[PDB]
Curated annotation (Swiss-Prot):
It catalyses: epsilon-(gamma-L-glutamyl)-L-lysine = 5-oxo-L-proline + L-lysine. Keywords: Lyase. Belongs to the gamma-glutamylcyclotransferase family. GO terms for biological process: modified amino acid catabolic process. Contributes to degradation of proteins cross-linked by transglutaminases by degrading the cross-link between a lysine and a glutamic acid residue. Catalyzes the formation of 5-oxo-L-proline from L-gamma-glutamyl-L-epsilon-lysine. Inactive with L-gamma-glutamyl-alpha-amino acid substrates such as L-gamma-glutamyl-L-alpha-cysteine and L-gamma-glutamyl-L-alpha-alanine. InterPro entries: AIG2-like_dom, GGACT, GGCT-like, GGCT-like_sf. Substrate binds at Y9, G10, T11, L12. Its EC number is 4.3.2.8. Disulfide bonds: none annotated. One of its GO terms (molecular function) is gamma-glutamylaminecyclotransferase activity. The keyword Lyase applies. This is Gamma-glutamylaminecyclotransferase.
Length: 147
């Protein structure tokens, strides 16, 4: 079957708190392909009570956002849609990604979880080039069922 390229910038990245879900074969297949940055700039904010990273769908604002390129199967793609609570919390959007390292040419089209349903005040939060839950912003990810 065909596969699909995705680009992850947040908790799904290697070394980030939700990476395990991509390594769990009960969800399908995800193969690491390399590192990239969005060709278009977008705001990346760490926001809400869970300190979740959100790539806001405001093309041309903020910065090119760095992340990782994976090739995934359809099962994994649908799992990630459910994981990200699409289309309410995030909407899956196809974006051009400049390839910085490859394990394809200069860029690759990838699905990315963006959001148009952010809280409006999140526009005033810092806009990140990259996400690290343990970064100096001091806002560590906490899991969804925490109150």
């Amino acid at each position: 079957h065909h596969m699909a390229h995705i680009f992850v910038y947040g908790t799904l990245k290697r070394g980030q708190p939700n990476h395990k879900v991509m390594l769990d074969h009960s969800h399908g297949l995800a193969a690491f392909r390399g590192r990239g940055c969005t060709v278009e700039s977008f705001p990346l904010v760490i926001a809400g009570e869970h300190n979740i990273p959100w790539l806001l769908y405001l093309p041309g604002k903020g910065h090119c956002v760095t992340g990782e390129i994976y090739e995934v199967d359809e099962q994994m793609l649908r799992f990630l849609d459910d994981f990200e609570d699409c289309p309410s919390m995030y909407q899956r959007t196809a974006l051009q990604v400049q390839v910085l390292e490859w394990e394809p040419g200069d860029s690759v089209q990838c699905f990315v979880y963006t959001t148009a349903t952010y809280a409006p005040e999140w526009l005033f939060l810092p806009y990140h080039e990259s996400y690290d839950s343990e970064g100096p912003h001091g806002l560590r990810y906490n899991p969804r069922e925490n109150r």
